[PDB]
Each structure stands twice: as C-alpha cells, then as structure tokens.
Subunit: 178 residues, 4 copies
C-alpha cells in the first residue's frame, strides 16, 4: 500500500538578498508583529530567544506544540537537511520564516537558499544600494585590501564591512585566472 | 505662453498600514541601506537625524543639494501641503520615503496618506498579525477600558498599546449610535 | 445604545497605475485563477460576464449569495459611493478586486482610487515602460496633435493610444498658463 | 594575470509558481508594456514572435544588438546551461524575463528554477486558488483517473487540466510506497 501524511496549513516565508540589504532586520520586523499578537516565536542561527545550532535537524529538539513561529537567520550556512527540516515544520502547521543570502560573493546561488526559495509559499528578495554608483544593488562584492576577490578564493568566509560591499551587477567585479 | 518645469527622476516610496505593522522599522531599514552606501539622508517627523516639524513646508528649510534621501514618518499627521511638498521634492531629484497609517481607528482613510499612495511611484502596504484571531490584520482597533471606541470619538488621539490593537476586518469593531 | 455590524473576512485588492501598465490584464489574470478553482465571479465596468453600471450602488442589484468574487475595472470613473460599496461587499465576505488609474494626466490622484488604496487589504501598483526613455513609467502623458495637454484641459477625456502615452516623471510634461 | 569582464546593467526577472497561477499571462503582460514603448522583444520556449529551442545555448543564435528584452517561458524544462545563458544575457545588457514552475508535482524544486530565483534581481512568485478548499494554492497536484500520483511516477509529464490541479499544501497529496 501507499502512505500519505496530511500536511497542515503552515507555510514558509523566505527573505533573501545580498549582504547589507536588511534581511535580518526584516526577519525581526516580522517576528515582532508576532509578539504584539502574543504568539510564541523562536529564532534559530548557526554559529523570543535566538538559539545557535550546528545541524538543521537539531531544530526539532528545541520546538514545542505551544510555539507558533519559527524563524531561522543566515540560512545559507545551514546543512543539507534544511530543506526537509523546514518542509516538515511547515507541514506540521508552523509559520516558518527564513533569512539568508541568495548569492555568494561570485554571484552564484548560496547553499540551500535557492531550494528554499523554490518550495516557499512566499519569497521576498531585498535590495541594498550600490556603494560604487548609488543604484539598486543585487550582489555582495568581496574586497581584500581594496581589491576584488578572485573567483577561486573560498566560498565561505565569515566577515562584515571590513571585506564586503553591496553592488549592482555592473559594478560587481569577480576576476578569474586565465 | 505656457510654463513647464522639467521634473528630475527623483521618486516617492510610501510605506503604510495599521499601527503595529512595522512601518517605522521598515522606514529605518530603507534609510539604513542608504548609509551603507554613504548617501546623505534626513528623517522628518511631526511632534542621520530625526527632525520635528509643525508644517509640511518647513521641510524645505532643512534641506540641501548635498542630501539624497528624505524620509518622513507618521505622515497621516502632516498638514494639507504634504502632497505638494513631496511632489516637489521628488521633482527636484530626491528619493522621498514616507511612512504613515492608511486608516484611522474607524477603518477610514487617514489624512493625506491616500493621496500620497496615489502619486507615489512605489507603495508598500504592511500587515500586522490580528490580536483576536492570529490571522493577517489590516485595521487598528481602538479600545477604551477594554471597550471598542465609538465611531464618533475624535479622529486624532495620540497613543500606543494602552489604547490600540491590530485586527483583521472580521475582528475590527467600530460601534455607531442609532 | 450603540450598533455594531460584524464584518466577515472578505477583502479588497486594488490594482492601479498609469494607462498601459496592464491593470485590466492583471485583473483578468486574477479572475481567471478564480475559474480554475470553480468559484463564481462577476466583473463590473462603467460605460464570467462583464456588466456595465451607471452608479456604484447598482452593483448590489447584480449580486448573489452564490457569488464569491467581485471585480470592478476602470474604478477612477466610479461615483462617490464606490468606497462604501466595496467596503460593504468585503464586509459581507466577498473577495473584491478593483482596477483603475492612480493618477489623471496631470499626475494628480484620480477619483476615489486613493481612498480605495487606503482601505484595501492589498494594493498592487503596476508600472509601464516610458515611451520617451525606456525606464519605468509612473505617469500617463496626454498629447494633443503631438503636444502635451495643458494643466487646465478637462480631467476626464475617454481615449487610448491616439492621445495617451506612459512616461516616467522626468519625461512627463504638464504645462501651465502663467 | 586575472581576467575581468565588465557586466552591463541588464537584469533578470523570474516569474514562478504552480501550474494555473498565470505565469505565462504575466510574462506576456510584461512583454506587452515593452511593445507600447516600442522596444524590441523576443520570447523563447522549449518544445514579437515565440521561438522554440532544444538547448539553452541555441538562444544566442536568435539574438541581436537591436533587441532589448528576452523572455523565456516554461523554464523548468530548459537544460543545465540556462543559468549561465541568462547570466550572460543580463551581463550583456538585456532585460531577461523568465517564467516557469517553482515545484514539480511532488512539491520538490523544479529544474534550474531555484538557481534562477537565486541569481535574479527580481523574483515574483504567483499563487493560484486551491481547487479543494478555495484558499491560496502553492502546489500542483497531479491526478491520474482522479487519484493522486505517487512520489515515484516520472518527474516530467506534459499535460494540462486533464491531469493537473492547483492546491494549498494542506490539500496537496503525494503518496509514497512503504
Ligand atoms: C557574500 C558572502 C558572504 N559570506 C559570509 C560573510 C558573512 O559572515 C555572512 C553573511 O552575513 O556570510 C560568505 O561566507 N561568502 C560569501 O560569498
Ligand atoms: C488608529 C489611529 C491612530 N492614531 C494615532 C495614535 C498614534 O499616536 C499614531 C500612530 O502611531 O496615530 C490616531 O490619532 N487616530 C487613529 O485612528
Ligand atoms: C490619464 C487619463 C485617462 N483618462 C481616461 C482615458 C481612458 O479612457 C481611461 C483609462 O483607460 O481614462 C482620463 O479621462 N483622464 C486622464 O487624465
Ligand atoms: C507539476 C508538473 C508539471 N509538469 C509539466 C506539465 C505541463 O506541461 C508543464 C507546466 O505547464 O509542466 C511536469 O512535467 N511535472 C510536474 O511535476
Ligand atoms: Zn553600481
Ligand atoms: Zn481577527
Ligand atoms: Zn522617461
Ligand atoms: Zn486547499
């Protein structure tokens, strides 16, 4: 015979975009509306309380039937389970709100974020303002001593303003070796 | 003869919605992207610095050719000039970002906000979560000692949580005399 | 004593923008999703069937308890009742979808559209592409024999391509007498 | 030495969602605004003119310096090159508009659509109305003789109403063997 688990009407909201676009601020705006309504919310991170986790499946250990809203920040960093983990959470009737980068510094899709964008009921893509020219940005520029990082430098490198900048595609510079 | 002033490509962004929807937080998110880009921003209020003003036309006194972005919060409160003031600012090439309530406590259009929504290049309408039932809110409920305010009580009454609550239309209650 | 009619969770969606932005096409897209779901829809116009009406209150005569979705096109043209008419429809539990111009040819708010934008749960503002320069348009330019219409010519003038064009604010030209 | 090709300010717009959500209609709305502005547009499909192509890289053969806008429908069907092909088109200064399913019938990410959603400047996710319950849909249900298709049936199966239906997640049924 065939098996069928009946999903509940939870859902997923994805917030994504380059660094500096206010993804985390928008996650928190949404979460805050939640509290004015007196719902129970929890926020997860890698490394209302914010709870660090080393694996996606660890999220389960921290959850209750009491809880209404599950937020996860910096999702690009989450492991390969994260797609399944959020699907199951939504299927259980939770509002799952998820924020992370769409693209790494090369302009390539970051981690499981594209998959989350695909399965999500709602997607919000935020833009920053380009540092070089003032028009809408859609990229994170990595700089090293003022110089644009090469296409071959590591995908993951934890940092902030000291290494990163928002740019439109025109101003985005990712040099390759020949 | 006929006169013609050539507008520049400034524009208007309206952020609106009931109390508690995060209008001001979203104004500030937008303004903050501005600073990461090193643009000059100013924020106006009734009663990056926040500058109180008693009339809309007073905004002009505080502006420069240096400045790039003009934000105005709590726009429902601004006088009858505000439509013209923002049109002229945009026409001068500024990015004008404006936040205020769409509706008063009766569910009726608040101040000049509907007109601003009409002339604006961008409109963003934010929703809170309903306090009574947990579904998307689109109204501000006024309560007085737990009781829903009558349709005849003043349009303007400055307050916060001690008198106000977000609700969907179903849960919104505005009683009338007979 | 005080009276209170309990609203149902109907709602309003406003679609607005300059001529040529595809307001009517988007109204119909939405309406069409409705039919794939086997809901009962009706469309109203001034002058699934499209039904002309000379007054807003006339809409009532054409409605049923069977019906689920009420669409109204060219709302700028509707009389002063239209705000109340749509509020009551929503309050009765209908999905009310409404399309019309945000601005007349002068760049001023058109009819009751700003009020509808204020009371609506959802607002969608569509942009066309500017004819003069190719960037996003937000205005309807009126031309008469190639020449930009004066600020004093009538507010209402029924027409299409033979008199009208979409423009950004920079390219929008509304001359005034001196 | 290192190589650097300077991108132009073209961009990508993704339109996605379940079957029946009006993706193609919205592609055409956008394309049509283009024509009112007198820009040169072309539309591509798998199998203003609509041009069938068997490989993504074939798109190049059909393009000019004259052309301004490149639309591609049913993108889930396009091969592994499509991400690169659209990146390069945007990088060359074209407005690239792309429409396809976010999810296959199992609720899993379809083809290269998630990657396109990640690299795109704009993402629009459209919802249909659920056939079973009338609330917003976010899934395509596959039915075979009235019965929900198993999780193991082929990923690709060309069809329309005779096999497919839009549903919310609650009503979506994808049975598995045990
Ligand atoms: C753009 C980018 C950011 N990051 C990191 C830097 C920050 O710590 C984090 C985004 O907040 O992601 C990468 O690891 N790789 C990248 O390509
Ligand atoms: C909803 C509502 C708010 N307000 C006030 C209360 C707050 O001070 C402000 C919104 O932040 O507006 C009114 O004056 N009238 C109203 O109907
Ligand atoms: C822009 C504009 C359009 N119209 C009319 C022309 C069209 O018939 C209709 C929009 O489809 O509105 C006006 O009457 N006044 C205006 O200012
Ligand atoms: C939902 C779904 C649609 N399709 C096909 C059916 C249609 O021909 C096309 C969407 O228009 O994609 C699949 O091949 N697999 C799927 O899972
Ligand atoms: Zn730039
Ligand atoms: Zn409610
Ligand atoms: Zn223009
Ligand atoms: Zn359903």
């Amino acid at each position: 015979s065939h098996m069928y688990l009946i999903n509940q009407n939870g859902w997923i909201e994805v917030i994504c975009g380059s660094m500096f676009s206010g993804k985390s601020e928008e996650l928190i705006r949404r979460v805050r509306r939640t509290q004015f309504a007196k719902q129970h919310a929890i926020v997860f991170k890698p490394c209302v309380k914010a709870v660090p986790v080393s694996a996606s499946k660890d999220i389960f250990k921290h959850i209750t039937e009491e809880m209404d809203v599950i937020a996860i920040d910096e999702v690009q960093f989450f492991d390969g389970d994260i797609v399944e983990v959020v699907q199951v959470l939504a299927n259980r009737g939770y509002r799952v709100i998820v924020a992370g980068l769409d693209q790494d510094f090369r302009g390539l899709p970051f981690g499981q974020v594209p998959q989350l964008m695909a399965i999500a009921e709602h997607v919000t893509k935020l833009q920053a303002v380009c540092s070089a020219c003032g028009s809408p940005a859609s990229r994170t520029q990595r700089l090293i001593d003022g110089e644009p990082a090469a296409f071959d430098d590591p995908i993951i490198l934890v940092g902030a303003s000291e290494s990163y900048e928002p740019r439109c595609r025109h101003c985005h510079a990712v040099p390759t070796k020949q």
